[PDB]
Amino acid sequence: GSALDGPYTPDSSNLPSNYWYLINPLNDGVVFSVTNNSTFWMFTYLILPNTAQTNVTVNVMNETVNISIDNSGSTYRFVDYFKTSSTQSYRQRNYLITEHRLQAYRRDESGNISNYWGSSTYGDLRVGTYFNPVLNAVINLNADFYIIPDSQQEKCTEYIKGGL
Numbered sequence: 001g002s003a004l005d006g007p008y009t010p011d012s013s014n015l016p017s018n019y020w021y022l023i024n025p026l027n028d029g030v031v032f033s034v035t036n037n038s039t040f041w042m043f044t045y046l047i048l049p050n051t052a053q054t055n056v057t058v059n060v061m062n063e064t065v066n067i068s069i070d071n072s073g074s075t076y077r078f079v080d081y082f083k084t085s086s087t088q089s090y091r092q093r094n095y096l097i098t099e100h101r102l103q104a105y106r107r108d109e110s111g112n113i114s115n116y117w118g119s120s121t122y123g124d125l126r127v128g129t130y131f132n133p134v135l136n137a138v139i140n141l142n143a144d145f146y147i148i149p150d151s152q153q154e155k156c157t158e159y160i161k162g163g164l
């Protein structure tokens with residue numbers, strides 16, 4: 001299991017815990033989403049370089065929502081949004097600034113989503129966790145992806161930093 005396991009085609013399912021799902025989206029827009037329809041709704045929006053700030057109305061888990069996006073740099077920005085009730089609107093949360101079309105997600109046994117936040121450029125690239133349990137919720141990976149055991153996290157980080 002030294003070889004990078006994948007790629008697998010886009011899919012929605014109750015993904016197993018303790019794996020990093022390393023997505024490699026070719027386009028932009030909504031690349032990841034999950035909800036338990038009760039306490040957590042989350043998605044990630046991929047924004048291309050040189051994107052003037054604007055509002056877009058997009059499909060998130062078959063609901064249309066209006067969000068502000070921007071990318072004033074020359075690299076990719078993966079931006080997370082979440083909310084914790086059906087009546088709330090989404091809030092922009094963490095983001096990954098990266099020269100690679102790569103982000104990764106892990107759901108731990110407590111049901112929490114982790115992914116990569118910050119950037120190599122600013123020296124704060126880190127695994128962050130949303131302490132918002134959603135065990136057994138359907139995860140949408142809207143991208144080709146690879147599967148890395150989370151005992152091999154440093155290998156995932158190396159891909160996030162340097163590409164495939």
Ligand SMILES: CC(=O)N[C@H]1[C@H](O[C@H]2[C@@H](O)[C@@H](CO)O[C@@H](O[C@H]3[C@H](O)[C@@H](O)[C@H](O)O[C@@H]3CO)[C@@H]2O)O[C@H](CO)[C@@H](O[C@@H]2O[C@H](CO)[C@H](O)[C@H](O)[C@H]2O)[C@@H]1O
Nearest residue numbers: 093094095096097116117118119122124125128129130131
């Ligand atoms: C865990 C996490 O998401 N950390 C983020 C940090 O999140 C904080 C932010 O969402 C604020 C918004 O008000 O809420 C914080 O939680 C508070 C609860 O909402 C509140 O009810 C409770 O009483 O107190 C909690 C603690 O204050 C939440 O933790 O937000 C910062 C700023 O955006 C993030 O850091 C930024 O991360 C990006 C990459 O994603 C870059 O690295 C930026 O340089 C960095 O500032 C932090 O990761």
